[PDB]
Amino acid sequence: EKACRHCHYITSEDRCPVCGSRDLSEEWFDLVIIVDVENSEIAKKIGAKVPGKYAIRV
C-alpha cells in the first residue's frame, strides 16, 4: 500500500484511483479516511470531494 505525493491519496495499487499517474513516496505516516464526502464536514474543511483514504503530511 502506497500514497500519491500530490493527491495525498493512500493507494493500495500501483495506480492512484483518482489520477492515472503512478506516483508514490513510501513515507506516509498519518491515515485519514472518509466514507461519504457529501455528509462528512471534515472533507468540507479539507476540500476533498472523493470518498476514500487520504494522508496529510507526506
Binding site: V32, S40, I56
Partner: protein
C-alpha cells in the same frame, strides 16, 4: 458530531481498516473515521449520536469503549492541517 473511542495502542491502523470494512455490512450512517498515528490508543469517529457508535463498536475485541462527552472539532484542527 465527533466521538472518541479507545483502542489498544498496538493495531490502531488496522482498527481503522476494519471499521471501514464493517460500515458496509449494515450500512451504518457514519461519515468519517480519524486515526492519526501521533495520538496513541484512541480514534475519532464521526456519527450522529451515541447509539450509532455503540452499534458500530460491538464485535471488535480491540475496541474497549467510547469516552463520554462530545469532542469539539475546535480541539483537533492542529492534526488535520
Amino acid at each position: 458530531k465527533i466521538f472518541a473511542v479507545r483502542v489498544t495502542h498496538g493495531q490502531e491502523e488496522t482498527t481503522a481498516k476494519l471499521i471501514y470494512s464493517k460500515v458496509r455490512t449494515y450500512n451504518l450512517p457514519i461519515y468519517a473515521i480519524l486515526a492519526p498515528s501521533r495520538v496513541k490508543g484512541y480514534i475519532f469517529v464521526e456519527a450522529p449520536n451515541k447509539g450509532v457508535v455503540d452499534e458500530a463498536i460491538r464485535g471488535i475485541r480491540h475496541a474497549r469503549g467510547v469516552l463520554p462527552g462530545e469532542v469539539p472539532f475546535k480541539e483537533i484542527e492542529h492534526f488535520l492541517e
